[PDB]
Design a protein around this motif. Structure first.
Motif, PDB file in Angstrom:
ATOM      1  N   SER A  89      -8.240   0.228  -4.453  1.00  0.00           N
ATOM      2  CA  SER A  89      -7.589   1.323  -4.023  1.00  0.00           C
ATOM      3  C   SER A  89      -6.381   1.844  -5.220  1.00  0.00           C
ATOM      4  CB  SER A  89      -6.712   1.099  -2.775  1.00  0.00           C
ATOM      5  OG  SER A  89      -5.705   0.138  -2.851  1.00  0.00           O
ATOM      6  N   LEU A  90      -6.119   3.187  -5.399  1.00  0.00           N
ATOM      7  CA  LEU A  90      -5.214   3.475  -6.241  1.00  0.00           C
ATOM      8  C   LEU A  90      -3.495   2.879  -5.800  1.00  0.00           C
ATOM      9  CD1 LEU A  90      -7.351   5.532  -6.883  1.00  0.00           C
ATOM     10  CD2 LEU A  90      -5.661   7.149  -7.469  1.00  0.00           C
ATOM     11  N   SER A  91      -3.353   2.845  -4.594  1.00  0.00           N
ATOM     12  CA  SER A  91      -2.329   2.546  -4.366  1.00  0.00           C
ATOM     13  C   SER A  91      -1.918   0.863  -4.774  1.00  0.00           C
ATOM     14  CB  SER A  91      -2.116   2.224  -2.301  1.00  0.00           C
ATOM     15  OG  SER A  91      -0.876   2.001  -1.975  1.00  0.00           O
ATOM     16  N   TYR A  92      -2.938   0.241  -4.519  1.00  0.00           N
ATOM     17  CA  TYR A  92      -2.874  -1.412  -5.027  1.00  0.00           C
ATOM     18  C   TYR A  92      -2.649  -1.448  -6.589  1.00  0.00           C
ATOM     19  CZ  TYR A  92      -4.041  -5.812  -6.671  1.00  0.00           C
ATOM     20  OH  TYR A  92      -4.044  -7.134  -7.389  1.00  0.00           O
TER      21      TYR A  92
ATOM     22  N   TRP B  28     -10.204  -3.137  -1.067  1.00  0.00           N
ATOM     23  CA  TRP B  28      -8.627  -2.671  -1.156  1.00  0.00           C
ATOM     24  C   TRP B  28      -8.145  -2.854  -2.649  1.00  0.00           C
ATOM     25  CZ3 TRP B  28      -4.788  -6.486  -2.511  1.00  0.00           C
ATOM     26  CH2 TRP B  28      -5.285  -7.807  -2.470  1.00  0.00           C
TER      27      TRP B  28
ATOM     28  N   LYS C 151      -1.778   0.929  -8.913  1.00  0.00           N
ATOM     29  CA  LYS C 151      -0.700   1.536  -9.421  1.00  0.00           C
ATOM     30  C   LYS C 151       0.647   0.557  -9.635  1.00  0.00           C
ATOM     31  CE  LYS C 151       2.431   5.176  -8.838  1.00  0.00           C
ATOM     32  NZ  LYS C 151       2.905   6.624  -8.331  1.00  0.00           N
ATOM     33  N   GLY C 152       0.561  -0.419  -8.592  1.00  0.00           N
ATOM     34  CA  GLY C 152       1.508  -1.712  -8.598  1.00  0.00           C
ATOM     35  C   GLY C 152       2.809  -1.000  -8.154  1.00  0.00           C
ATOM     36  N   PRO C 153       3.755  -1.950  -7.711  1.00  0.00           N
ATOM     37  CA  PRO C 153       5.143  -1.548  -7.312  1.00  0.00           C
ATOM     38  C   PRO C 153       5.933  -0.866  -7.990  1.00  0.00           C
ATOM     39  CG  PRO C 153       5.193  -3.686  -7.885  1.00  0.00           C
ATOM     40  CD  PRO C 153       3.818  -3.422  -8.098  1.00  0.00           C
TER      41      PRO C 153
END
Ligand SMILES: [Cl-]
Lengths: 63, 12, 57
Positions: free
Chosen positions: B4-7, B1, B9-11
């Motif tokens: 993952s790119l989602s993680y 996890w 990339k940050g918020p």
């Protein structure tokens, strides 16, 4: 289904939130503007989006 | 996890 | 540490890596980064503001 000009709103009875092309998402109690009706599937607008949803998931709000 | 790119990339 | 949190209100993703959820959804929290948390719900992953959820003890 709907006559030209007809104005209809409906309230979501439950959430329907899986993203799929041409599907309108909403959460329980959201108020949806109903734009077209085609048997068991209606087309509507809410929270900046449009799409189809099961008519059973909503209840019409009196005008 | 954590890969993952989602993680990553940050918020913001 | 896989914390569980319940959505107090619905929240819609602002960006492509934000999590979407409805009020009362139970979210699995993977990371806490100050005001933003990273988690998973309904098989989807993403970031969301922690203010929208409450930890389930
Ligand atoms: Cl859905």
């Amino acid at each position: 289904g709907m006559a030209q000009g007809a104005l209809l709103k409906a309230q979501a009875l439950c959430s329907w939130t899986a993203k799929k092309d041409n599907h309108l998402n909403f959460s329980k109690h959201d108020i949806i503007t109903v734009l077209e009706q085609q048997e068991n599937w209606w087309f509507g607008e809410v929270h900046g989006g449009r799409g189809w949803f099961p008519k059973s998931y909503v209840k019409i709000i009196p005008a | 996890w954590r890969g993952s790119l989602s993680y990553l990339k940050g918020p913001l």
